[PDB]
Design a protein around this ligand. Sequence first.
Ligand SMILES: CSC[C@@H](NC(=O)[C@H](CS)NC(=O)CCC[C@H]([NH3+])C(=O)O)C(=O)O
Ligand SMILES: [Fe+3]
Length: 328
Amino acid sequence: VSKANVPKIDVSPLFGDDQAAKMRVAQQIDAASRDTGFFYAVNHGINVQRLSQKTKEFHMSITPEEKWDLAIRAYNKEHQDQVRAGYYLSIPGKKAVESFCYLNPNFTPDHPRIQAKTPTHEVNVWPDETKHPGFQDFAEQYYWDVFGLSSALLKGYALALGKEENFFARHFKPDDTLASVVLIRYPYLDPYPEAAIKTAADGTKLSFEWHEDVSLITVLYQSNVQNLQVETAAGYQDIEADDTGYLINCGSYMAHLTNNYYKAPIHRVKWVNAERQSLPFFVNLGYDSVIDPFDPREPNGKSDREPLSYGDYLQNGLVSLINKNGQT
Ligand SMILES: CSC[C@@H](NC(=O)[C@H](CS)NC(=O)CCC[C@H]([NH3+])C(=O)O)C(=O)O
Ligand SMILES: [Fe+3]
């Protein structure tokens, strides 16, 4: 398989006030978005080594009892309110992956959307503080660090599409974003059960099948173990690993809003027998956020798509992804 073109882009100007330098970053985002759909954000300012260390400490110390106590409803019928947030268990002999998902720390018991029991909004669940000292505080702070990077990236995408820098960012707010962090553990297993390995039509062994992301953009940290592939006009291509940067791509809400000018790249996860991490941040807007679809390839910029609220998009997309590629 040939190597995919995934450029490294220094996104540091997006945190500053040099408008010309921001346009030069926006062009790089435009170019990558129009080519393979992927780029590595470098000079992003986040301490990813500490994120990996704290995540490993958690994954390797959590016990079976704690996983049931934090489990989503797909694994524990007693937790009917946990559709998104909580622990997603492995099934030894059958399913290797396991993970922990958390949402906006501002979704507290008194938040208006939590009081209304609005779909896709939940109060996070956390392990015992005595058993995992500092974990909740670290994880909540990580949400806000990656939120800050994501806001800066959204400024770059807006400028790239010919809009004002707050075009997307104005709908991405601390008090109501539906964004999520997922701490995914992909384990080393000896023997690796065949039931946990899928095979693509082209013969490639996979851990997760082809898909488009359910997001506006996805901001991903991964270990230094090659595993991702992107479908291009030249076929599936390997994405090189880089554990110092963030791998960025568009999700299907960006494809909808831009009329496929910036596509949501189809990508898949190869099977690798290695202990590693996949830590995505899905950049989701607010429940009622609606951006009128447009088309940057058309002179009048008009699109033939109907407006879709982010809440409707997200609820439907997450269900569809489970139906297509299985409960994770
Ligand atoms: C390289 S794909 C990256 C990663 N796979 C995932 O993260 C998959 C596909 S993006 N996403 C999902 O299952 C949606 C989770 C949504 C979350 N539960 C929520 O409530 O927000 C991986 O396997 O490495
Ligand atoms: Fe994905």
